[PDB]
């Protein structure tokens, strides 16, 4: 089970660009269709998804693949929202980053015996820009490569 009524919105969005009745819609109009359902990806994500959708260079996506892409986008969006909520739980001081203080506070509240050296080891292994902590995007990325969620 994925969706019950949200599929109708995706069908409407596809049919808006499928007014010619060819069964497929143009890849270039993919951004508008996402904006037809509220999705607002950046240019990099649009290029990445066009590359995956149009590997064979057809330039069109059918109903099934469009529905699958929309479902994947919705799942990733709600996962991102939950990850943001987790970040806020960690960043209860609203610093924009899960600093070492935030991680230590969460660990002590969690009651785990995770050593401060291990906390900073995780921070650095989750630190990419070298700012000395973990940012929103860094936490998002490490969750994306997370073992399971």
């Amino acid at each position: 089970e994925l969706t019950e009524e949200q599929k109708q919105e995706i069908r409407e969005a596809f049919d808006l660009f499928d007014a010619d009745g060819t069964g497929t819609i143009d890849v270039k109009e993919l951004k508008v269709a996402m904006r037809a359902l509220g999705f607002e990806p950046k240019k990099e994500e649009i290029k990445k998804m066009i590359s995956e959708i149009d590997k064979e260079g057809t330039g069109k996506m059918n109903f099934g693949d469009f529905l699958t892409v929309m479902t994947q986008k919705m799942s990733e969006k709600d996962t991102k929202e939950e990850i943001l909520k987790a970040f806020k739980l960690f960043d209860d001081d609203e610093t924009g980053k899960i600093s070492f203080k935030n991680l230590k506070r969460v660990a002590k509240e969690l009651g785990e015996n995770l050593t401060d050296e291990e906390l900073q080891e995780m921070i650095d292994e989750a630190d990419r820009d070298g700012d000395g902590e973990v940012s929103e995007q860094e936490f998002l990325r490490i969750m994306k490569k997370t073992s399971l969620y």
Partner: protein, 31 residues
Amino acid sequence: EKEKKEKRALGNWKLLAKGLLIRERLKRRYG
């Protein structure tokens, strides 16, 4: 060894995340 310690850090991240998830879920269950 490098990948083992990296996976250890990832597993610690996952355990902490799941623990916070369960804490929030049970708090919502009773508050």
